[PDB]
Design a binder for this molecule. Sequence first.
Ligand SMILES: Cn1c(=O)c2c[nH]cc2n(C)c1=O
Ligand SMILES: Cn1c(=O)c2c[nH]cc2n(C)c1=O
Ligand SMILES: Cn1c(=O)c2c[nH]cc2n(C)c1=O
Ligand SMILES: Cn1c(=O)c2c[nH]cc2n(C)c1=O
Ligand SMILES: Cn1c(=O)c2c[nH]cc2n(C)c1=O
Ligand SMILES: Cn1c(=O)c2c[nH]cc2n(C)c1=O
Ligand SMILES: Cn1c(=O)c2c[nH]cc2n(C)c1=O
Ligand SMILES: Cn1c(=O)c2c[nH]cc2n(C)c1=O
Ligand SMILES: Cn1c(=O)c2c[nH]cc2n(C)c1=O
Ligand SMILES: Cn1c(=O)c2c[nH]cc2n(C)c1=O
Ligand SMILES: Cn1c(=O)c2c[nH]cc2n(C)c1=O
Ligand SMILES: Cn1c(=O)c2c[nH]cc2n(C)c1=O
Lengths: 127, 127, 127, 127, 123, 123
Amino acid sequence: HHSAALEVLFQGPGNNELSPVALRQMSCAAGTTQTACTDDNALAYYNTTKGGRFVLALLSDLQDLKWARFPKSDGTGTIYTELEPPCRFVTDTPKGPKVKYLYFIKGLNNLNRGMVLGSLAATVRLQ
Amino acid sequence: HHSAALEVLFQGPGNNELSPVALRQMSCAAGTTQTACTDDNALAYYNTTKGGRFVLALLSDLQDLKWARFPKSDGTGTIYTELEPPCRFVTDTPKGPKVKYLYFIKGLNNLNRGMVLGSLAATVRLQ
Amino acid sequence: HHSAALEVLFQGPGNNELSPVALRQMSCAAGTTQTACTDDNALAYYNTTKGGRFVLALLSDLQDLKWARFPKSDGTGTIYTELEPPCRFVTDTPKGPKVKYLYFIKGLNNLNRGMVLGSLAATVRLQ
Amino acid sequence: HHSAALEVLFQGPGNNELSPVALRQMSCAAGTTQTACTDDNALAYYNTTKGGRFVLALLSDLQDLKWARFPKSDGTGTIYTELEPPCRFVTDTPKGPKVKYLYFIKGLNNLNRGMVLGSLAATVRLQ
Amino acid sequence: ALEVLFQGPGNNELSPVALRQMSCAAGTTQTACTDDNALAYYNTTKGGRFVLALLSDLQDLKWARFPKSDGTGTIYTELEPPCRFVTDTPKGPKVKYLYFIKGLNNLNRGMVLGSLAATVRLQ
Amino acid sequence: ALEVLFQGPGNNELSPVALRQMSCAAGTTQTACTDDNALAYYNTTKGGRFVLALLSDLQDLKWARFPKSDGTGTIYTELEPPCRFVTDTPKGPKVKYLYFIKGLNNLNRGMVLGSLAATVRLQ
Ligand SMILES: Cn1c(=O)c2c[nH]cc2n(C)c1=O
Ligand SMILES: Cn1c(=O)c2c[nH]cc2n(C)c1=O
Ligand SMILES: Cn1c(=O)c2c[nH]cc2n(C)c1=O
Ligand SMILES: Cn1c(=O)c2c[nH]cc2n(C)c1=O
Ligand SMILES: Cn1c(=O)c2c[nH]cc2n(C)c1=O
Ligand SMILES: Cn1c(=O)c2c[nH]cc2n(C)c1=O
Ligand SMILES: Cn1c(=O)c2c[nH]cc2n(C)c1=O
Ligand SMILES: Cn1c(=O)c2c[nH]cc2n(C)c1=O
Ligand SMILES: Cn1c(=O)c2c[nH]cc2n(C)c1=O
Ligand SMILES: Cn1c(=O)c2c[nH]cc2n(C)c1=O
Ligand SMILES: Cn1c(=O)c2c[nH]cc2n(C)c1=O
Ligand SMILES: Cn1c(=O)c2c[nH]cc2n(C)c1=O
């Protein structure tokens, strides 16, 4: 349904084991408030487990986002997730440098924030 | 002196800006005891600093390592540097799979641990 | 196979959701070193996922433990897990107060340590 | 003045000793805005302190709360206390299931968040 | 200034660093960041300044405006909820509020708190 | 003593507290904790003392022996690996090692570092 994006290493299933997981990415609608989430304007990175999707972070050209909208598990409605203030970084593209803003989901711990930052740094070409 | 290894993103120079940094790698001598830190048996990932090197983690084929003895040029404040218990992960060699052990330096914070894990996951062929 | 012990609340499967999980408990052999893990002398609290068991903490009458021994996923051998230094607490029993030592597994984060402490405090009768 | 609610274990008086403490509960006034903090609409879990009360979390039927206004007797250093985004969890009522929202006080550390989650999980009928 | 100890340049070495202060316009909202009403404590970096914390007489601040010459990624930085502390001054006690920048890690929050406690006459 | 700021007794209030010092026998192993060779900084608690950190001239310590009158759960407490810092004294610079007690949280580690940096003449 959606494409693989950022590889990470989660602990488990046993103690002191690491398992590789591909975070997937999907287009999503974000905005300054829930009802401003209309047109797709961001890319969300998420993990999938049996119970559904867990979103870790969003990338966007826009710097004023605060909320993102996602489909619920099994087309059963809508979910809204609150965002942290963004960090700015610059990518290298065929059109020149492109400024991006990285938003973590509120309530993401620092280990997982770091895994997103490192896998992004290693995967996308940076200016 | 040594090769670039893992790309990461550090905040700075100011608030909410991310800047790319390549961690580098060098061979180093680790051991189950401080006296056993003799011959190179691990790869250290480090950030260059003004007047030294800050090591984040070691990668080894060996289990049960507890200490590393880094060269004086690193500028460590103690002769021996202590390791955390290793994380086991499996790489994809041309010869099949190979089990590796990742040892964080004691005290490394969770954001930086995560950045190493995500950059490693995105940079090396896994399974 | 083993009995339910400590209820906790893990985040997921979606963002900002909590799911109740019963940690289970099993007798295990612990000791000052791996080969000293012979007779059962501790109780281990663990979570089960598809890939196997993840141990969070041990309880014992003994205060000098450093290692614990566990069966591998699917009777495929033995696992050894390193322990943090213990904390002492006192329970209330039909034989009077009983001193216990709680050992977290090395590499357990503070959120999960707290969940063990709180669920223990609420589940066992304390002196 | 108020009833005991959630048992936890705090380290002290000295290193490596755990002492039981009952967090207590009282009704409190929360709101989406500071001005809306009017009538009691949440339950606060707190630790009694010499000269005040330290609130760890609020439980509410309501979503979208952001602030609480605690009584002067709590000894808060600011008029309004800010809440984290809530965690959703489901209790088992005689009437069926009931969705509740758990709001940690902003800044509560991970150990103490975990102790609240584990004590709650062990103390209330869940699902 | 507030003296702190940062690890580096090698592992397990501590180097003393002075956090410096600059005036700062903060506010309940970004649009209200119009006039200097706080002191921002920062670490000088190659190419800029990283702000750790603000001190103010006001307890309702949420956003701060920093100079782009800090090497910032955004004009505004969000603040954590403030903590109250009371200084002992010759003109009597004075109530202040300490704000960490949003997301500052706990080691660095602690260093500001400890440096403040040892540097300023408190009560 | 090292002054720090603890939160409480209510939310978002900061209260100044002096960490006091006592002599401490530490060692590479518990059995080697035979003679005072470190200074332990502690917070006084109802019923005891909670040690946060040790200072020593030695860089190889791993365990510390505390008095049971501290209200401890065990005689010995493990130490984190030390960090080196250099004090500026009239008799010249002197190298010291700072050890946190195992598991001290990062806020409290930071408070010790910041208080130390502001209290002691360093370099
Ligand atoms: C930190 N942490 C947990 O608490 C988990 C509980 N079930 C699965 C978990 N995983 C993969 C994890 O990383
Ligand atoms: C508490 N806990 C668990 O139950 C886990 C199950 N798989 C991975 C886990 N991790 C990392 C964890 O911390
Ligand atoms: C957490 N943290 C710090 O404290 C720093 C101090 N100088 C540079 C720093 N960086 C890049 C950082 O990430
Ligand atoms: C305290 N502090 C600093 O001084 C920094 C300088 N560059 C990046 C920094 N970060 C993230 C930080 O926390
Ligand atoms: C913190 N954390 C994680 O990173 C997880 C990755 N897969 C499942 C996870 N769970 C349940 C968790 O709690
Ligand atoms: C990164 N991550 C995940 O992928 C999760 C999947 N289920 C629960 C999760 N949690 C809490 C998390 O942090
Ligand atoms: C982390 N931490 C502290 O800093 C304390 C200071 N006085 C009492 C404390 N307790 C119980 C605690 O857990
Ligand atoms: C700094 N500090 C203290 O002062 C404590 C007093 N009782 C328990 C304490 N704990 C866990 C702590 O970290
Ligand atoms: C936590 N942390 C870091 O990540 C740093 C990266 N470069 C310099 C750093 N410093 C001083 C620091 O404290
Ligand atoms: C990851 N990392 C670094 O690169 C550092 C460079 N100087 C100091 C550093 N510290 C404390 C750190 O954690
Ligand atoms: C983190 N923490 C705690 O958990 C406390 C419990 N009683 C007193 C406490 N104090 C002062 C503290 O700082
Ligand atoms: C959980 N908890 C408490 O009970 C406290 C009592 N006084 C201060 C406290 N702090 C900072 C805290 O986190």
